[PDB]
Design an enzyme around this catalytic site. Structure first.
Site, PDB file in Angstrom:
ATOM      1  N   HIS A  11     -20.259  31.207  -2.315  1.00 43.56           N
ATOM      2  CA  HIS A  11     -19.205  31.147  -3.318  1.00 43.56           C
ATOM      3  C   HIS A  11     -18.134  30.114  -2.981  1.00 43.56           C
ATOM      4  CE1 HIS A  11     -15.413  33.040  -5.142  1.00 43.56           C
ATOM      5  NE2 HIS A  11     -16.103  32.573  -6.166  1.00 43.56           N
ATOM      6  N   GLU A  31     -22.321  27.668  -5.068  1.00 40.31           N
ATOM      7  CA  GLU A  31     -21.553  27.577  -6.290  1.00 40.31           C
ATOM      8  C   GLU A  31     -20.320  26.713  -6.003  1.00 40.31           C
ATOM      9  OE1 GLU A  31     -18.490  29.382  -6.742  1.00 40.31           O
ATOM     10  OE2 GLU A  31     -18.152  28.862  -8.841  1.00 40.31           O
ATOM     11  N   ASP A  33     -16.887  24.646  -7.959  1.00 37.80           N
ATOM     12  CA  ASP A  33     -16.020  24.563  -9.138  1.00 37.80           C
ATOM     13  C   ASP A  33     -15.807  23.126  -9.534  1.00 37.80           C
ATOM     14  OD1 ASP A  33     -15.393  27.447  -9.187  1.00 37.80           O
ATOM     15  OD2 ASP A  33     -14.713  26.950  -7.162  1.00 37.80           O
ATOM     16  N   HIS A  47     -10.795  24.720  -7.050  1.00 39.11           N
ATOM     17  CA  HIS A  47     -10.609  26.029  -7.674  1.00 39.11           C
ATOM     18  C   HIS A  47      -9.109  26.275  -7.936  1.00 39.11           C
ATOM     19  CE1 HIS A  47     -10.593  30.371  -8.312  1.00 39.11           C
ATOM     20  NE2 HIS A  47     -11.915  30.376  -8.342  1.00 39.11           N
ATOM     21  N   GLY A  48      -8.313  26.235  -6.873  1.00 34.05           N
ATOM     22  CA  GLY A  48      -6.887  26.570  -6.956  1.00 34.05           C
ATOM     23  C   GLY A  48      -6.599  28.059  -6.977  1.00 34.05           C
ATOM     24  N   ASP A  52     -10.635  34.192  -4.798  1.00 35.02           N
ATOM     25  CA  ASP A  52     -11.132  35.350  -4.067  1.00 35.02           C
ATOM     26  C   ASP A  52     -10.341  35.663  -2.800  1.00 35.02           C
ATOM     27  OD1 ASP A  52     -13.118  36.150  -5.832  1.00 35.02           O
ATOM     28  OD2 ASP A  52     -14.693  36.119  -4.317  1.00 35.02           O
ATOM     29  N   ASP A  91     -19.646  25.549 -11.630  1.00 36.41           N
ATOM     30  CA  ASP A  91     -18.734  26.411 -12.372  1.00 36.41           C
ATOM     31  C   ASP A  91     -17.785  25.466 -13.081  1.00 36.41           C
ATOM     32  OD1 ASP A  91     -16.883  28.237 -13.316  1.00 36.41           O
ATOM     33  OD2 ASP A  91     -16.438  29.096 -11.335  1.00 36.41           O
ATOM     34  N   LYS A  93     -14.984  24.371 -15.084  1.00 34.79           N
ATOM     35  CA  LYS A  93     -13.703  24.960 -15.424  1.00 34.79           C
ATOM     36  C   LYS A  93     -13.198  24.277 -16.692  1.00 34.79           C
ATOM     37  CE  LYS A  93     -13.535  27.762 -11.810  1.00 34.79           C
ATOM     38  NZ  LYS A  93     -13.467  29.239 -12.022  1.00 34.79           N
ATOM     39  N   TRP A 224     -21.766  38.817  -8.815  1.00 35.30           N
ATOM     40  CA  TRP A 224     -20.715  38.141  -8.035  1.00 35.30           C
ATOM     41  C   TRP A 224     -19.416  38.973  -8.047  1.00 35.30           C
ATOM     42  CZ3 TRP A 224     -16.065  36.816 -10.356  1.00 35.30           C
ATOM     43  CH2 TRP A 224     -16.034  36.834 -11.779  1.00 35.30           C
ATOM     44  N   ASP A 227     -19.326  40.905  -1.093  1.00 36.11           N
ATOM     45  CA  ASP A 227     -19.044  40.647   0.320  1.00 36.11           C
ATOM     46  C   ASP A 227     -19.273  41.873   1.199  1.00 36.11           C
ATOM     47  OD1 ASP A 227     -18.236  38.078  -0.434  1.00 36.11           O
ATOM     48  OD2 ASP A 227     -16.099  38.620  -0.473  1.00 36.11           O
ATOM     49  N   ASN A 246     -19.009  35.394  -0.504  1.00 31.11           N
ATOM     50  CA  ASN A 246     -18.204  34.598   0.420  1.00 31.11           C
ATOM     51  C   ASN A 246     -18.818  34.616   1.817  1.00 31.11           C
ATOM     52  OD1 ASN A 246     -15.913  33.743  -1.310  1.00 31.11           O
ATOM     53  ND2 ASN A 246     -15.552  35.968  -1.475  1.00 31.11           N
TER      54      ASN A 246
HETATM   55  C1  LIG Z   1     -14.844  48.326   2.471  1.00 28.37           C
HETATM   56  C2  LIG Z   1     -13.914  49.165   1.635  1.00 28.37           C
HETATM   57  C3  LIG Z   1     -13.820  48.642   0.216  1.00 28.37           C
HETATM   58  C4  LIG Z   1     -13.650  47.136   0.168  1.00 28.37           C
HETATM   59  C5  LIG Z   1     -12.215  46.722  -0.019  1.00 28.37           C
HETATM   60  C6  LIG Z   1     -12.059  45.562  -0.938  1.00 28.37           C
HETATM   61  C7  LIG Z   1     -12.096  44.336  -0.064  1.00 28.37           C
HETATM   62  C8  LIG Z   1     -11.986  43.032  -0.743  1.00 28.37           C
HETATM   63  C9  LIG Z   1     -13.204  42.218  -0.397  1.00 28.37           C
HETATM   64  C10 LIG Z   1     -13.480  41.718   1.004  1.00 28.37           C
HETATM   65  C11 LIG Z   1     -14.415  42.686   1.686  1.00 28.37           C
HETATM   66  C12 LIG Z   1     -15.365  42.088   2.690  1.00 28.37           C
HETATM   67  C13 LIG Z   1     -15.363  42.874   3.996  1.00 28.37           C
HETATM   68  C14 LIG Z   1     -15.110  41.971   5.197  1.00 28.37           C
HETATM   69  C15 LIG Z   1     -15.917  40.695   5.113  1.00 28.37           C
HETATM   70  C16 LIG Z   1     -16.679  40.350   6.337  1.00 28.37           C
HETATM   71  O1  LIG Z   1     -17.772  40.887   6.503  1.00 28.37           O
HETATM   72  O2  LIG Z   1     -16.173  39.534   7.094  1.00 28.37           O
HETATM   73  O1  LIG Z   2     -19.216  34.498 -10.725  1.00 26.19           O
HETATM   74  P1  LIG Z   2     -19.458  33.446 -11.781  1.00 26.19           P
HETATM   75  O2  LIG Z   2     -19.259  33.928 -13.199  1.00 26.19           O
HETATM   76  O3  LIG Z   2     -20.709  32.627 -11.572  1.00 26.19           O
HETATM   77  O4  LIG Z   2     -18.262  32.392 -11.559  1.00 26.19           O
HETATM   78  C1  LIG Z   2     -17.260  32.631 -10.572  1.00 26.19           C
HETATM   79  C2  LIG Z   2     -16.143  33.484 -11.182  1.00 26.19           C
HETATM   80  O5  LIG Z   2     -16.107  33.260 -12.597  1.00 26.19           O
HETATM   81  C3  LIG Z   2     -14.745  33.232 -10.604  1.00 26.19           C
HETATM   82  O6  LIG Z   2     -14.060  32.277 -11.423  1.00 26.19           O
HETATM   83  C4  LIG Z   2     -14.785  32.725  -9.162  1.00 26.19           C
HETATM   84  O7  LIG Z   2     -14.473  32.874  -8.233  1.00 26.19           O
HETATM   85  C5  LIG Z   2     -15.629  31.455  -9.003  1.00 26.19           C
HETATM   86  O8  LIG Z   2     -14.767  30.313  -9.073  1.00 26.19           O
HETATM   87  C6  LIG Z   2     -16.754  31.293 -10.032  1.00 26.19           C
HETATM   88  O9  LIG Z   2     -18.106  30.993  -9.685  1.00 26.19           O
HETATM   89  C1  LIG Z   3      -9.400  34.757 -13.870  1.00 29.41           C
HETATM   90  C2  LIG Z   3      -9.691  34.108 -12.527  1.00 29.41           C
HETATM   91  C3  LIG Z   3      -9.262  35.025 -11.384  1.00 29.41           C
HETATM   92  C4  LIG Z   3      -9.765  34.560 -10.016  1.00 29.41           C
HETATM   93  C5  LIG Z   3      -9.627  35.656  -8.950  1.00 29.41           C
HETATM   94  C6  LIG Z   3      -8.192  35.804  -8.451  1.00 29.41           C
HETATM   95  C7  LIG Z   3      -7.899  37.106  -7.703  1.00 29.41           C
HETATM   96  C8  LIG Z   3      -6.727  37.891  -8.314  1.00 29.41           C
HETATM   97  C9  LIG Z   3      -5.386  37.169  -8.177  1.00 29.41           C
HETATM   98  C10 LIG Z   3      -4.289  37.809  -8.999  1.00 29.41           C
HETATM   99  O1  LIG Z   3      -3.702  38.807  -8.538  1.00 29.41           O
HETATM  100  O2  LIG Z   3      -3.986  37.318 -10.109  1.00 29.41           O
HETATM  101 MG   LIG Z   4     -16.236  29.277  -9.218  1.00 30.33          MG
END
Ligand SMILES: CCCCCCCCCCCCCCCC(=O)O
Ligand SMILES: O=P([O-])([O-])O[C@@H]1[C@H](O)[C@H](O)C(O)[C@H](O)[C@H]1O
Ligand SMILES: CCCCCCCCCC(=O)O
Ligand SMILES: [Mg+2]
Ligand SMILES: CCCCCCCCCCCCCCCC(=O)O
Ligand SMILES: CCCCCCCCCCCCCCCC(=O)O
Ligand SMILES: CCCCCCCCCCCCC(=O)O
Ligand SMILES: CCCCCCCCCC(=O)O
Ligand SMILES: CCCCCCCC(=O)O
Ligand SMILES: CCCCCCC(=O)O
Length: 279
Positions: A11, A31, A33, A47-48, A52, A91, A93, A224, A227, A246
């Protein structure tokens, strides 16, 4: 039956150095952007904010620079060739563009890809390409892209090109978009949410149901951004073809679990990404 081939999609791979980073962790796909300037020319792989969770949102290249880097990573014989990297999702934009620039954007994208990725047909990069469009109303981008390749004398490069509408639209609405565009294959269906927020499997199940029905339009489905090991198992249990992540090493570890090794395998160049899988 046979193992379903799986695309592990790195990603937000927007700097040239990140191609190796993600592929070396186990990704067979990335993927990237693509931002557009005021004239619908691809400008940056940027991306900006917001992006994620746990990620630097601001790594970027001039789009053509990234393309040349991608070409090196996907051209057999190049010092940086990665045999494993077989699919790239752009992707697009297109949110910064007026709707009536969607076609223009397709043409400019085709020009850049032809020049810098496919090298005018001279020993170009070999990866399959998915043009991912976030807005159903921007479907005319597809015809623009095609028509530009055709004008430049490389209509055959469309064999390497597929499609995605990434906006989590109703599946029936997506199908109608493809019908308007006159597209009848090479269709990937994204479903998902940022890794920062929770999501269920209802739409991904419906996309899988469409893909596996006799008269559905989806060829492949990807989820998508995933993680976590538990989420990975859920998505694989649901029967997805692709997992965008990711952390490609997390996905890889799950696929290497004994139970999953029997049902899935990492897709290679000889797995056609446009073909619906059958046991
Ligand atoms: C695991 C409890 C629920 C998940 C909480 C939401 C977390 C946001 C996403 C990132 C989670 C990835 C976990 C660590 C990544 C890694 O393996 O290094
Ligand atoms: O998951 P997907 O629909 O293929 O496209 C993704 C999401 O739309 C989101 O914008 C993100 O983080 C990435 O920039 C894009 O790939
Ligand atoms: C619509 C695109 C969103 C990309 C993901 C951003 C993560 C959330 C950030 C926020 O709190 O706003
Ligand atoms: Mg993207
Ligand atoms: C092809 C040159 C790319 C740079 C674009 C700068 C000026 C904007 C062009 C208007 C877009 C019209 C679509 C033309 C498609 C094309 O032939 O490139
Ligand atoms: C690539 C080897 C496949 C055949 C292995 C038979 C199934 C046993 C796997 C047990 C899990 C070990 C994970 C190792 C993953 C690997 O590097 O292949
Ligand atoms: C004809 C009504 C459109 C059904 C929905 C189609 C999905 C997106 C297409 C946008 C283009 C609108 C059009 O010109 O049909
Ligand atoms: C927008 C359709 C793109 C798919 C390209 C492959 C077949 C095109 C048929 C044609 O030549 O017109
Ligand atoms: C590590 C997995 C080894 C295979 C054991 C069960 C085989 C089967 O499915 O019949
Ligand atoms: C296989 C044909 C794809 C486009 C048609 C979408 C639909 O089934 O409505």
């Amino acid at each position: 039956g046979n193992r379903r081939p799986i695309w592990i999609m790195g990603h937000m791979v927007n700097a040239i150095g990140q191609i190796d980073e993600f592929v070396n962790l186990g990704a067979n796909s990335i993927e990237t952007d693509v931002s557009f300037d005021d004239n619908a020319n691809p400008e940056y792989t940027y991306h900006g904010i917001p992006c994620d969770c746990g990620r630097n949102c601001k790594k970027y290249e001039n789009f053509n620079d990234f393309l040349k880097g991608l070409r090196s990573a996907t051209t057999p014989g190049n010092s940086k060739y990665q045999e494993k990297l077989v699919l790239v999702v752009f992707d697009l934009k297109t949110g910064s563009l007026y709707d009536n620039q969607a076609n223009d954007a397709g043409k400019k994208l085709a020009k850049n890809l032809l020049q810098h990725y496919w090298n005018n047909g001279n020993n170009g990069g070999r990866a399959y390409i998915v043009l991912s469009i976030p807005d159903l109303n921007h479907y005319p981008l597809i015809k623009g892209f095609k028509d530009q390749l055709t004008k430049d004398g490389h209509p055959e490069l469309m064999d390497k090109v597929g499609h995605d509408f990434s906006g989590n639209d109703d599946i029936g609405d997506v199908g109608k978009a493809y019908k308007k565009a006159g597209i009848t294959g090479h269709i990937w269906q994204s479903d998902g949410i940022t890794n920062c927020l929770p999501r269920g499997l209802s739409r991904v199940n419906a996309a899988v149901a469409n893909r596996d029905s006799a008269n559905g339009f989806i060829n492949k489905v990807y989820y998508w951004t995933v993680d976590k090991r538990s989420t990975t198992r859920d998505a694989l249990d649901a029967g997805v073809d692709g997992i965008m992540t990711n952390y490609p090493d997390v996905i890889t570890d799950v696929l290497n679990e004994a139970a999953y090794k029997k049902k899935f395998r990492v897709a290679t160049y000889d797995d056609n990404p446009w073909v619906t899988f059958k046991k």
